[PDB]
């Protein structure tokens, strides 16, 4: 039975998570941008990086943005679609929330969102969050609307990896 730190060490060794510049501290209580999380998903699920394609209109989303290949992969894969379809905003600097992460992993794992789910999640996410809870990706007392901590993301990613095996 591994601690959150040991799960992190393992995922980092596997190249799925990385740390912070200048320090080996894993900063498990810190948050994560949607950009960095896209990359996590790409490494976690072995997705192919997509260069030279730009499907969003966010400021500074272009060839100079290191995250675009990962964001494009998770979008082609159907894991993430962004926050606004008519304006094509992904919001890559905003932080990944528990309910957002829940959707991505539930989808990757082909678990079915719970229609009729009763919980504190935003409307669009209720079923994804319930499915993620039921599958043990996040604790039931996690706050679906909060920014996910890196600890929570390490636990969720580690559990998801084990379910793909
Ligand atoms: C605010 O709208 C939500 O935005 C969420 C952003 O996070 C993810 C995981 C994403 O697809 O990128 O999920 C999004 C939700 O589907 C939802 N987006 C829309 C367009 O309805």
Numbering used by the authors: 28 to 192
Any passages from the paper?
Prokaryotic cell envelopes often include proteinaceous surface (S-) layers composed of self-assembling subunits in porous two-dimensional crystalline lattices. SpaA possesses three consecutive SLH domains near its N-terminus, followed by a large C-terminal region presumed to harbor the self-assembling domain(s).
We investigated the effect of this flexibility on potential ligand binding in G1 by solving additional co-crystal structures in different space groups (P1 and C2), where further unique conformations of residues 44–54 were observed. This 1:1 binding in solution likely occurs in G2, because this site is occupied in all five crystallographically unique molecules and has better complementarity with ligand than does G1, which was only occupied in one of five molecules. The pyruvate moiety of the ligand is bound deep in the pocket through salt bridge interactions to Arg61 and Lys130 and hydrogen bonds to Gln108 and Gly109 backbone amides, while the hydrophobic face of the ManNAc ring stacks against Trp151. Upon binding in G2 of wt SpaASLH, the phi angle of Gly109 (SLH-Gly29) and the psi angle of Gln108 (SLH-28) each flip by ~180°. The backbone carbonyl of Gln108, which hydrogen bonds to Arg61 (the conserved SLH-Arg43) when unliganded, is resultantly replaced in space by the Gly109 backbone amide nitrogen, which forms a hydrogen bond to a pyruvyl carboxyl of ligand. Concurrently, the removal of the hydrogen bond between Gln108 and Arg61 allows Arg61 to make a bidentate interaction with a pyruvyl carboxyl and O6 of ligand.
